[PDB]
Amino acid sequence: SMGESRVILAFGDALFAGYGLDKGESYPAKLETALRSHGINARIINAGVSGDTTAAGLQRIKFVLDSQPDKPELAIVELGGNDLLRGLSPAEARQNLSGILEELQRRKIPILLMGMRAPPNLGAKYQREFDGIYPYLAEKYDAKLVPFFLEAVADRPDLIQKDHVHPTARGVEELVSATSNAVAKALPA
């Protein structure tokens, strides 16, 4: 092909940073290679930051854009999962994401929004509220939406890293049954 590469900003959290993966295995790196098969030579800026909430993303979006030598021709925004993990307000996550998309739209950078989905642990009221923020934002900011970014691994535990292991309430009872003898013995009589 002739010419310089197309510049894409991947603005996200651990799912873009490649947490737990080797060099070149992250989603931005592998997406860059896959776009070759669409006739596209892209340079994807990996602006994933592990642990970033929507507020953290809002705090740095201007800095990240102002730091680029080449203005992004597309910005892919993937945030909200860490708000989920902290049980944070879905309303505030929507507001923070709105601020991010507003900055991109001000600069006339096209947007692809990666939809996040809440697990049932947070309850149906929270889950419905959280899930709905992404179609709302995509419509409001004329962004293209991937409705469920992790859909392709949702039924594939073999494609998910083993890392955090937080027991459920029933799992806690299991651990208590297994370890209470040791605690009782360790406590002086």
CA distance 89 to 32: 34
Burial of 110 (0-12, 13-18, 19+ CB in 10 A): middle
Domain extent at residue 156: 1-189
Domains held by the chain: number = 1
CB neighbours of 64 closer than 8 A, spacing ≥ 6? 9, 11, 47
Residues paired with residue 114 on neighbouring β-strands, in sequence order:
146
Cα separation of 159 and 141, whole Å? 33
Coil, strand, or helix at residue 98? Answer: helix
Coil, strand, or helix at residue 167?
coil
H or E stretch at 43: strand 42-48
